[PDB]
Amino acid sequence: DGEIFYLPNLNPDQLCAFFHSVHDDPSQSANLLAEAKKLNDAQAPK
Amino acid sequence: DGEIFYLPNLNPDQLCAFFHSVHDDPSQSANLLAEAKKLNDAQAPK
């Protein structure tokens, strides 16, 4: 029942933005989560 | 370390404040934790 994907890279605005689209319509969640992962990956500050 | 906590009942906007306190003040991410879990506690019982 679901797995976890942490996005410790994304700032509050980005982070909040992910579920904002999701919660409006949980169908795109997987897609959104992806862009979250992808974002996390895109900027991934070490 | 790594004590997972779920915020299913909180909405993007509810969670918004959490990051804001958390990223602005990591020094209280636990006291902040309390608040999100508080909020997730607050609105939890529908």
Binding site: E3 | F5, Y6
Partner: peptide, 22 residues
Amino acid sequence: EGVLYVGSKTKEGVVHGVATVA
């Protein structure tokens, strides 16, 4: 069908992750 806001209480003390529920 959705994603769950999850956090993990760690060294930094709170990470914002997602539990994607199918």
